[PDB]
């Protein structure tokens, strides 16, 4: 009931973040520290972090053949031992495999070779009764290293690794010849061993870090229970793949969210701040600011739909694009915000040119415009092909923006029909195609949604979205339970 938890990952908010990996390692650890657990978080050191200080400790790392010197940097924040791994590989201005062999390996050193006394309830070295939590493919090998170098020599013999899937898209697939360079024994190859692109003209044998992580761990997790059930069922498409393997007993837990970065009553990028009681009036003001900034007609009576996402197949921008003409029979505005694959940037931009004064694609990275979007939109459209958990819909609800979303993964868990958003049904997993029947669903659900905007019932929805606890308090008790089931 009083465990040492060590999280490892390639990202760590606020220091580093791109997807929901950063977010999770930002907020979940402290929430577990608040519950009376000693909690560390190791991730690389990509820049010279102001708040992070040199601890003078060093291990030397066996990667390929090059012996490598890493420095440990520290930072005790929100009841959390936050540890960064220093090396010129990370400090940048195939090589990716060396970088993260570094991370995995170092992470195995920090629980033993560091004196951390900052905590009023725990002292000195973390020890060897550790629960490791590995996040994404970048830390897949950790369990293997631990079995390779520590458990035969009688170290960490009680320990347990849990492995968490944040997104099945990126698996760490490497040429199989490169295996030796992990300096892991032969008994662990078969865990990495992978047939990529089966029965397609680019079928090739590969080393797969995510697969290693999953097979070698004592407990496998992902970021949503429905998605767990999607994976256990073999709906498991990473888009540019099928199934991976026969997954089993995977446990899903819905992510919380950084409720301080995203907080309509304190946000500083938006025109009007608010809570549930003042949301209707303030969102109207944000909506008119937003119309102004997007060069669309400024009018609060026009319902405004927003898409915000990486322009990748996963998030269905092509499906979003296809539905615009249908939606354009209605009196609505659409604002899209994302970057990625240019054939998509090209699609949305063509959509702006065809319907000016009605559609605005902002292909650009713009954190501040995203808050404004979130505060001013009436509906957020999330036509995803797959969605492990999602952050966008959580962010929406936090800002009282209900979500019209595809019925997959985390969206099924977090978005309730008629209470906090509208389900479109499940879209075709066949990423390359845009099924016309899917285009039909998306437009239909968006027509329902906007037809509700303005009615009193819509305002209840807004209130519903804003009354939810979307912090980590609730999810952290779910994690705690899973980690306690692990014996140690």
Q: What is the CA radius of gyration of the chain?
A: 23
> Is 364 annotated for ligand binding?
yes
Question: Is 335 in contact with 377 (CB distance < 8 Å)?
Answer: yes
Q: Is 417 exposed, middle or buried (CB count within 10 Å of its CB: 0-12, 13-18, 19+)?
A: exposed
Look at residues 146, 184, 186 and name the one whose alpha carbon lies nearest to residue 163.
146
Name every residue whose Cβ is closer than 8 Å to that of residue 439 and which is 6 or more positions away in sequence. 319, 322, 323, 326
Name every residue whose Cβ is closer than 8 Å to that of residue 41 and which is 6 or more positions away in sequence. 6, 7, 8, 9, 12, 25, 29, 80, 81, 82, 83
Beta bridge pairs of residue 220: 163
Q: Which residue has tokens 């090059």?
A: 66
Domain edges within the chain: 1-257+469-488, 258-468
> Is 419 annotated for ligand binding?
no
Question: Is 8 in contact with 107 (CB distance < 8 Å)?
Answer: yes
Question: 258-468: which CATH topology?
Answer: Rossmann fold (3.40.50)
Domains 1-257+469-488 and 258-468 share a fold: yes
CA dist 447 → 61, 284, 374 (Å): 58, 20, 20
Q: What is the resolution of this structure in A?
A: 2.7
37 sits in the region (left: phi over 0; alpha: psi -120 to 50; else beta) called: beta
Question: Is 222 in contact with 200 (CB distance < 8 Å)?
Answer: no
Q: Which residue has tokens 């059930």?
A: 229
State both tokens at 339: 């970057």
Residue 15 phi, psi (nearest 5): -60, -45
The approach used to solve this structure was X-ray
The CA-based dihedral angle spanning residues 170, 173, 178, 183, taken in that order and rounded to the nearest 10 degrees? 60
Give the CATH superfamily of 1-257+469-488. Answer: Glycogen Phosphorylase B; (3.40.50.2000)
Sign of the C-alpha dihedral, residues 333, 339, 344, 347?
Answer: positive
> Is 310 annotated for ligand binding?
yes
> Is 17 annotated for ligand binding?
yes
Cβ-count burial 56-78 (b if 16+ within 10 Å, e if not): eeebebebeeeebebbbbbbebe
Question: Is 416 in contact with 400 (CB distance < 8 Å)?
Answer: no
**Angle at which helices 279-293 and 456-467 pack, to 10 degrees?**
90
Cβ-count burial 425-450 (b if 16+ within 10 Å, e if not): ebbeeebeebeeebbebbbbbbbebb
Name every residue whose Cβ is closer than 8 Å to that of residue 178 and which is 6 or more positions away in sequence. 94, 97, 207
Name every residue whose Cβ is closer than 8 Å to that of residue 131 and which is 6 or more positions away in sequence. 3, 4, 5, 6, 159, 160, 161, 162, 483, 486, 488
β-bridge pairing 204-208 and 193-196: antiparallel
């Amino acid at each position: 009931h009083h465990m040492n938890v060590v999280f490892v990952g390639a990202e760590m908010a606020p220091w580093s973040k791109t997807g929901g990996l950063g977010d999770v390692l930002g907020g979940l650890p402290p929430a577990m520290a608040a519950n009376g657990h000693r909690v560390m978080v190791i991730s690389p050191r990509y820049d010279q972090y102001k708040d992070a200080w040199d601890t003078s400790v060093v291990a030397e790392i066996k990667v390929a053949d090059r012996y490598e010197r890493v420095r440990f940097f520290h930072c005790y924040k929100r009841g959390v031992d936050r540890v960064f791994i220093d090396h010129p590989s990370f400090l940048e201005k195939k090589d990716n495999q060396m970088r993260f062999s570094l991370l995995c390996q170092a992470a195995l050193e920090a629980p033993r070779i560091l004196n951390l006394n900052n905590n009023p309830y725990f002292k000195g070295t973390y020890g060897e009764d550790v629960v490791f939590v590995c996040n994404d493919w970048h830390t897949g090998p950790l369990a293997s290293y631990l079995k390779n170098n520590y458990q035969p020599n009688g170290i960490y013999r009680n320990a347990k690794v849990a492995f968490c899937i944040h997104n099945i898209s990126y698996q760490g697939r490497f040429a199989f010849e490169d295996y030796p360079e992990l300096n892991l024994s032969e008994r662990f190859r078969s865990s990495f061993d992978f047939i990529d692109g089966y029965d397609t003209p680019v079928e090739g044998r590969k080393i797969n870090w995510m697969k290693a992580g999953i097979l070698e761990a004592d407990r496998v997790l992902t970021v949503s229970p429905y998605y767990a059930e999607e994976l256990i069922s073999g709906i498991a498409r990473g888009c540019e793949l099928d199934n991976i393997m026969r997954l089993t007993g995977i446990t899903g837990i819905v992510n919380g969210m950084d409720v301080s970065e995203w907080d309509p009553s304190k946000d500083k990028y938006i025109t009007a701040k608010y809570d549930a009681t003042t949301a209707i009036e303030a969102k109207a003001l944000n909506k008119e600011a937003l119309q102004a900034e997007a060069g669309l007609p400024v009018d609060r009576k026009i319902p405004l739909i927003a898409f915000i996402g990486r322009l990748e197949e996963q998030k269905g921008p092509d499906v979003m694009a296809a539905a615009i003409p249908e939606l354009m029979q209605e009196d609505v505005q659409i604002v899209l915000l994302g970057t990625g694959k240019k054939k998509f940037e090209k699609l949305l931009k063509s959509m702006e040119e065809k319907y000016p004064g009605k559609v605005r694609a902002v292909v650009k990275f713009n954190a501040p415009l995203a808050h404004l979007i979130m505060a001013g939109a009436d509906v957020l459209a999330v036509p995803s092909r797959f969605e492990p958990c999602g952050l966008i819909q959580l962010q929406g609800m936090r800002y009282g923006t209900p979500c019209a979303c595809a019925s997959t993964g985390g969206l099924v868990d977090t978005v309730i029909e008629g209470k906090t958003g509208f389900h479109m049904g499940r879209l075709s997993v066949d990423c390359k195609v845009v099924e016309p029947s899917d285009v039909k669903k998306v437009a239909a659900t968006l027509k329902r949604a906007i037809k509700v905007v303005g009615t009193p019932a819509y305002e209840e929805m807004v209130r519903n979205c804003m009354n939810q606890d979307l912090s980590w308090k609730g999810p952290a008790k779910n994690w705690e339970n899973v980690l306690l089931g692990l014996g140690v």
